[PDB]
Design a protein around this ligand. Sequence first.
Ligand code: HEM
Ligand SMILES: [Ar]
Length: 148
Amino acid sequence: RPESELIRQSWRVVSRSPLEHGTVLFARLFALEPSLLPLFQYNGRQFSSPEDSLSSPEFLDHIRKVMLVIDAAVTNVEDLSSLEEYLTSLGRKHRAVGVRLSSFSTVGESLLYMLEKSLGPDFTPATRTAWSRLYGAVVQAMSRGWDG
Ligand code: HEM
Ligand SMILES: [Ar]
């Protein structure tokens, strides 16, 4: 505690409808950083517009994969060292597909946006601070996949 409990309580709301909330996360992401759009290359083709991504089964499967990684982080919030090796290889995979490490800061802001809009009154400054810390720890582990 105390960050721990704020994370578990707030995630309970989001995890009721993961694809709907993850849709908000990625809509926001492309609004902030449109140059992330070409990195989702399924069947060797590029999405033209952000709304094109929302029709792609492969893209929606990636939303589910994202939400499952965040769920594992919440389940393990008391000790994240258990996920470190997995997160390092997840970083390496994203480096491989072309994501720059700086772009994970925009992902974090999109995550915070999605929580603010979902929780409304209930997304307190303490809750924000807890999620920033948890997300920061996840990215620090992933960052090792970009060497060092
Ligand atoms: C700008 C942000 C991101 C981009 C452009 C991106 C793109 C991709 C791409 C192209 C793949 C490979 C194809 C696929 O499996 O759908 C992938 C795999 C994956 N991504 Fe992401 N991703 C991003 C962020 C994230 C985040 C934040 C997470 C989790 C916290 C995540 C979790 C995954 C997982 C679990 C896989 C499967 C990895 C594997 O092969 O084992 N991604 N991502
Ligand atoms: Ar997170």
